[PDB]
Paper text:
The apoNS3H protein crystallizes in space group P41212 at 1.83 Å. NS3H has a clover-shaped architecture divided into three domains containing seven conserved motifs of SF2 helicase family. Domain 1 (residues W188–E329) consists of six β-strands surrounded by four α-helices, whereas domain 2 (residues P330–G486) consists of three α-helices and six β-strands with one antiparallel β hairpin passing close to domain 3. The resulting 3D protein structure shows overall similarity with already published helicase structures of other flaviviruses.
The helicase domain of nonstructural protein 3 (NS3H) unwinds the double-stranded RNA replication intermediate in an ATP-dependent manner during the flavivirus life cycle. The NTPase active site is located in a cleft between the subdomains 1 and 2 and involves motifs I (Walker A), II (Walker B), and VI. Here, we biochemically characterized NS3H from TBEV and obtained structures of key intermediates along the [name] cycle (nucleotide-free, apo; ADP-; adenylyl-imidodiphosphate, AMPPNP-; and hydrolysis product, ADP–Pi-bound NS3H).
Residue numbers in the entry: 182 to 250, 260 to 501, 507 to 621
Write the structure that this text describes.
Amino acid sequence: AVVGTGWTSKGQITVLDMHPGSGKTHRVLPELIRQCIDRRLRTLVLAPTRVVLKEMERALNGKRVRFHSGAIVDVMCHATYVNRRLLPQGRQNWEVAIMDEAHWTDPHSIAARGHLYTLAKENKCALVLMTATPPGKSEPFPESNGAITSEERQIPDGEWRDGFDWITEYEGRTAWFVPSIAKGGAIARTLRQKGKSVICLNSKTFEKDYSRVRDEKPDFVVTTDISEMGANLDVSRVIDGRTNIKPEEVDGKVELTGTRRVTTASAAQRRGRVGRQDGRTDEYIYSGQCDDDDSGLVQWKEAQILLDNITVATFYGPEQDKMPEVAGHFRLTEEKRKHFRHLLTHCDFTPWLAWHVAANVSSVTDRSWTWEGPEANAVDEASGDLVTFRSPNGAERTLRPVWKDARMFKEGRDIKEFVAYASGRR
C-alpha cells in the first residue's frame, strides 16, 4: 500500500504510479475496496477494457461488488461510465472514484478522468488515478520490478529479408509494437515466412484474442497501442519503433495518414510490457525519440465532445491545455444528445462523426447525408472503384458522406458495416 487514509476524503486526488507486476490489481485494488466497504463509501472503479474488468472481478472475489457488462461498489469500463452519462436521466453519483490505467488517450478515457477531476476539484468526491505514466511529465525509462536492458537499433518498418538477424535469432518471446493494423499485417507476414508463430493484437482483436497469447505462447505478439493499458503479454523482449497512427481533423475531415512519434508516456507503457519480474533481465529494443506534443490529434476534440455532453468542466489538469474549444462548445440539446448516443453505442460511430451527424441532420431516419457530401468525400475500395449501395427504394447510391472520418472505413472498422447504416438496414 502507498496511502493510509484521507485518500477517501472529498476533494482528495491521489495518483498511484506503481510499476507493473508489484501487485496493483490483486493486492492494492482489493485493499482500497476493503477500506471503501468498511467506511460505507459509494465507490466507482473504472477498468480500461473488458480484459481488465474480468481480472478485477477475480481479484474482488468475495466482496459485494457490482460489475457492469445490494452492493455499494460499482465496477465498469471507462467507456461505460461516460456512455451512461449521455442519458441525462442516468448519472448516478459516487463519493470515491478509482480509475485504472488512467493515462489512456482514448476519448472516453480522457473525458472520464476530466469529469472525475472536475468533481473532485469541486469537492464532490475523492479520486484515485492508477497509472505508471500519469498525465504531465513522463520519463521514457521509468523504474521497473526487474531489469530492462534498453538499446536503440534500426527496426524494420515493413517486410524485410536480410540485415536484421537479431530479430529472429532471439530465443525468448517478443512483443513488437506497430503504429497501425496495416503495418502489423506486413510485419506478421514476414515473421511467419521466417518460421515464427505470430498473434496480432489491436483495437479489433484485443477483447477476443488476448487469451490466445497465454494459451498459445506465440514467438511474436504484433500489437498496436491497444497493449499499453494493462496487457500482460508474458514476453522477454519488446521491439518498439516508437510510432503511432495520427488521426487528425484536416480541412473538416478526419484523416489517417502517416505516423507520429509516440509520446513518452506511450514509450514507457510499451517498455512497461517487460521488466515485470525481479531476478530476470528483459530487453527493450527501440528506434528514435518521443514527441509529447499530441495536441493536434482529434482525440482531444472527441474528449471535449463527450465531456460537454456528460456534464465548468475541464480535462484532468495538465491536459486542460489540450481542450481545443471553450468548455460547453460541443454541448447538444437533450434530443440531439439522444441521437448522438445511439450513433456511438448502436452504430459504432466515432465521437467526431456521431457529433457532426447529431448536431446537423434533421431526423434520426435520414440517410441522405451519407451520399450528399462533396465529390471528394466519395469512399473507394482498395480495388479503386467507389462504394455503391441501394436505398430501400432501390435507388443506387455512391457512398459520399457529408462528414468523412477515415476511421469508419479501415483500421479495424469495415466499409460493409457503414453501408448497413447508409442503406437504412441499421
